[PDB]
Symmetry: D2
Subunit: 245 residues, 4 copies
């Protein structure tokens, strides 16, 4: 087991990637705290794997704070954190309402800052550790996603800065950049659009949440002890070359 007795907290743990990550980490022997917005599915997901459920709204500074206090009270320490909690509000920029722009930045960018800052305080000067922040292949720009791309590009920048500041404290910070992963949130994607995303993917298929989880496992485990400030794309090569269409 790669996370034997490691205390890890995971956000957005109730669905898709967060869920698959919670399961993989549990099999790897981690002492977990599952966080998400909705208590109902949070408890179900957490119980199915033996983790401790803690409702958290990564968008609410107070919520993130209370959550980490509970997690620390329950775990006693923090060895790593994988942050997922993210949303989208697609629209070409000229039809994008300010409210939609500010909501995704608040949730994805500031939310990552709040969770990361909390993760840092729980570890800095206490023990070495590893923080994994999730951005997206889209941070490089993508049609109809100026807000998503800006917020996730911001997360990459945050990661590199945090990595610079925490390095001497044995704390690593890296960011995942998944591509088109099949989850409940992508079920709505139209078939003519799916055919198009897959065509721009050298590996010719959609990704599976377990695959993102493994990337997370690697970054959080001691096997990546000499890797920090990095952006790991898990998009099947979707970003090697630019996607037309």
């Amino acid at each position: 087991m790669r996370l034997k007795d490691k205390a890890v907290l995971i956000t957005g743990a109730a669905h898709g990637i967060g869920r698959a990550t919670l399961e993989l980490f549990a099999k790897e022997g981690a002492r977990l705290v599952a966080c998400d917005i909705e208590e109902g599915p949070l408890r179900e997901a957490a119980e199915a794997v033996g983790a401790h459920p803690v409702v958290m709204d990564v968008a609410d500074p107070a919520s993130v704070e209370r959550g980490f206090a509970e997690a620390l009270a329950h775990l006693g320490r923090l060895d790593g954190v994988v942050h997922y909690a993210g949303i989208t509000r697609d629209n070409f920029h000229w039809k994008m309402p300010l409210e939609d722009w500010e909501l995704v930045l608040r949730v994805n960018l500031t939310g990552s800052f709040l969770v990361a800052k909390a993760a840092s305080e729980a570890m800095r000067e206490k023990n070495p550790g590893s923080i994994v922040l999730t951005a997206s292949r889209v941070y490089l720009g993508n049609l109809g996603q100026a807000n998503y791309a800006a917020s996730m590009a911001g997360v990459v920048g945050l990661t590199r800065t945090l990595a610079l500041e925490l390095g001497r404290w044995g704390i690593r910070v890296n960011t995942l950049a998944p591509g088109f992963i099949e989850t409940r949130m992508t079920a709505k994607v139209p078939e003519k659009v799916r055919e198009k995303a897959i065509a721009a993917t050298p590996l010719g298929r959609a990704g599976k949440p377990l695959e993102v989880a493994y990337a997370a496992l690697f970054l959080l485990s001691d096997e990546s002890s000499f890797i920090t400030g990095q952006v790991l794309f898990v998009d099947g090569g979707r970003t090697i070359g630019a996607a037309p269409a």
Copy 2:
């Protein structure tokens, strides 16, 4: 002249870089609209160049909106925009108050969004054009600047996305990433030491990069990050 009759609006036009850009563009024959927060220094910088002063708080949606209306009413068209307006609130993350984090994002990232969105609105399907957003070499991460780096990194992401959505309309979107520009003591030596060209940059030099990006000489260039940092970023993984 490279901006002969071109209608250009410039933000942060009262300060160093913006001011230097107003002067250059004026010499290049542009019909300018100067924008900034403080009327006093704005009016003066605009008058010395023959530009039309328009007070603007890029952090305020309504101000940006009224601003562009005045610019359009005065120019009749918009051919390019160079957005500078930016701020910092340094601190190691563990000492960085949320308020500080949200202010720089609001002013730097959301401000760039409001300005670019208005610029686009004035040009899309009307005429080709060029938009230049100013980021910073720090978007690659820098000690004590999590908020600044994240916001500028967002600007780079915004510019790329904008470049993709506007390309078919003949509108180019590019981003300037200045390094260490003149107007501090031991902070200077370390900076210059990490600079291959061995010196601080001058606002004029950043203005020239803006001139290039906005003129028709960069007509086939869009979605790019142009570092004007004296090579301070060579050797660092690009983002």
Copy 3:
């Protein structure tokens, strides 16, 4: 005139991009030396502009050396160099003969080293200056171009190292990365190819040699005096979305 009386040497000056650059640089007041492999078309292109023709095989160490001695004898100094000489030998890697791989590397990568080295020797410790090497948007990887991509990616790496070593000598080194430029080796490219590239280009058109020439003018003139070690893409946004390198 941004190149008033500046001594400039251009390789591949007889071909599309180089020719347009000779013409623009001539208008900008530069004292030019035009280099290329075939004497006939070189003399024609040089004369049409008032440049001094010097036949050169950028792949031959001695040819490059002789060429630069002529250049210096005629110019007396070197203010800048713009290098364009390059070749392609497409094929999926499994059908690529070693010979084709070694040729494009020798010409494109080693050829840039030879020219950059000569240019540097002519300026280092004598006067500040600007050197512009031409890579390609394809350095980021492209179907059927393992050799071209590898060689052009090497040029970017070469540029970056050279900018670090020459920085203190007031000598700047930058790379141009042109996209689909309408010249002659493209005039009759099969219509489905021309269509492919344009669909992947946000500005929706092929680039013109003159446009690459202006980027060269910018980088070489005193207007980019504080810019070095950079990769300037001139591909109409065709690379937007691809993970940077």
Copy 4:
């Protein structure tokens, strides 16, 4: 075990990073073929782990070819390859002799092309697989290393091209970019350099070959099944800000 029954070939397996990878991959249950230039230390490193030694000069087309024929005769299939074999010839460009420039490219850049080409040929249309080529953080430019920087940057471009071409065949191609790794080569490096290297490393120390080995394990195993065309830096953050 992460590489159970996986048939893998590793170059430069006799020393440092390659040897560490060989050892790790053996514990992970891989059926290995160790390749390196010197038979003496090659057989030793391979025998100590149960790998099959095959002498190979990555700079020689025929040598690489015979090597893979032996590897295949012994393995019967190829599931992955980790290429390390590289060299340096430092010097500021004005003092860098052509021969030194051509040797590092031939060995590092062409060498990788030869090994990746043989690896691809053994897998394309036969089975999905993973190819890991080793570049270096220096691919981004470094004082006194024009030739090394260019060769490694070329490997990054090669990796990306290969990834695009082999994706449809279920074959992934990724590249490692190690930083300052504590080896029996960096030991002699003058303290001037050491202090300068460690100082520019957020993690404040040199890397160990095992750490680079783990990165290779990840990229070669099915754990990175949806990752291709990537450059994974294993430099302790040295490349974050230069």
